[PDB]
Amino acid sequence: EAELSAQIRYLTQVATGQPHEGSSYSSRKDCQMALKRVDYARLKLSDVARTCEQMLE
Amino acid sequence: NELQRKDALVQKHLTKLRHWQQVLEDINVQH
Amino acid sequence: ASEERREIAEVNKKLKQKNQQLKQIMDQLRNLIWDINAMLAMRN
């Protein structure tokens, strides 16, 4: 009982902010977005390799 | 000779292009 | 010689065909260098 009562005392003064607005989104969206840009390089580099694989014949 | 030079340029292209294809894939598997 | 001219035409046809393989490469290589710069320059 004391340990839980300690938590409430711990919570009361240091915490209990109503909302939170951390908003770790401007990095998440642009990360996968950067990967999509990297992915666009993947396929098109390979297509070039296929195209110049035809050069060898 | 011109065709031989053309093919030689290709071989320079492919190995370099293939080399880049490896690292780009490598940067993808790491994500 | 007539036969020699024929071989030149065959070489030209092979070279011309190889050139077609080459033109697509530039367009692809050109397109990629176009796309990478356009995508990056807009970066935030």
Q: Do A56 and B27 touch (CB under 8 A)?
A: no
- Do the beta carbons of residue A45 and residue C32 sit within 8 Å? yes
Task: Pick from B1, B6, B7, B16 the residue to mutate for testing the C interface (most C CBs within 10 Å).
Answer: B6
Is-contact B6 C18, C-beta < 8 A? Answer: yes
The angstrom resolution of this structure is: 4.5
- The answer to whether the CB atoms of B28 and A52 lie below 8 A apart is no
How many angstroms separate the CA atoms of A52 and B18, rounded?
A: 11
Return d(Cα C40, Cα C44) in angstroms, integer. Answer: 9
Which residue type is seen at A32? Q
| Alpha-helical runs (H) found in B1-31 | 2-30
**Which DSSP symbol is given to C34?**
H
Which method was it determined by?
Answer: cryo-EM
| Alpha-carbon torsion angle A36, A37, A40, A42, nearest 10 | -90
Taking the C-alpha atoms of residue C32 and residue C25, their distance in angstroms, rounded to an integer, is 10
